[PDB]
Design a binder for this molecule. Structure first.
Ligand SMILES: N[C@@H](CCC(=O)N[C@@H](CS)C(=O)NCC(=O)O)C(=O)O
Length: 215
């Protein structure tokens, strides 16, 4: 199997998580952010992630990829219950986290931005949809306060460091990518159960945190 991604893309992280949790090899390939030709040839639209199955078929959609991979060996791991409280929290934080993440992604040394044109493509598309990056960065301290406050609420919902609801579930798939990407945001106050879950799930999934790149 092969997986076509951007390193910053949370949907790509979801797909990467199931390969890491099950110790399944996969050939990761980062596409440039301005590359429409490759994904459109594969799945008829420009988006990532894209899985190539062993028989050469290409398949988009992070949660279809997660479901497919988790069933291959007949022993799915994502058997635990989801939590309405976690869904509510993610609904709230996914409503604004991009205001912190997008301007920081755009400055950072991710492979999908390795040409000037690919980085500029991201900046121009995302300033159009999310707003002027200088203005988003001007509001960093208020947005960091908001994240830190919301992380204190999440802290009470982290049942175990290895699984947000106590048994591995799709809520780990939905939550970890956001926490991983938030480690790029210098200044966040991380509560202890959230921090332990972040670190434990990074190890289980073999996905790097971005703490060393934080800005
Ligand atoms: N529903 C898709 C969402 C994927 C997605 O929105 N990926 C973003 C990158 S994070 C992307 O491909 N946007 C279009 C682009 O980069 O041209 C999934 O779950 O895989």
């Amino acid at each position: 199997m092969k997986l076509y991604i951007y390193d910053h893309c949370p949907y790509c992280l979801k797909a990467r998580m199931i390969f890491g949790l099950k110790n399944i090899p996969v050939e990761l390939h980062v596409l440039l952010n301005d590359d429409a030709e490759t994904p459109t040839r594969m799945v008829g639209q420009k988006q990532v992630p894209i899985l190539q199955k062993d028989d050469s078929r290409y398949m988009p959609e992070s949660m279809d990829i997660v479901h497919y991979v988790d069933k291959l060996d007949g022993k799915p791991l994502l058997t635990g219950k989801r939590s309405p409280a976690i869904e509510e929290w993610l609904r709230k934080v996914n409503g604004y986290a991009n205001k912190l993440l997008l301007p920081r992604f755009a400055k950072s040394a991710f492979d999908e931005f390795s040409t000037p044109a690919a980085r500029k493509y991201f900046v121009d598309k995302k300033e159009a949809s999310a707003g002027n990056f200088a203005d988003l960065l001007a509001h960093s301290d208020g947005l960091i306060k908001n994240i830190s406050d919301d992380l204190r609420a999440l802290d009470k919902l982290i049942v175990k460091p290895n699984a947000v609801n106590g048994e591995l579930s799709e809520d780990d798939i939905q939550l970890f990518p956001l926490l991983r990407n938030l480690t790029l945001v210098a200044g966040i106050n991380w509560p202890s159960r959230v921090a332990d879950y972040r670190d434990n799930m990074a190890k289980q999934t073999q996905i790097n945190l971005l703490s060393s790149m934080a800005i």
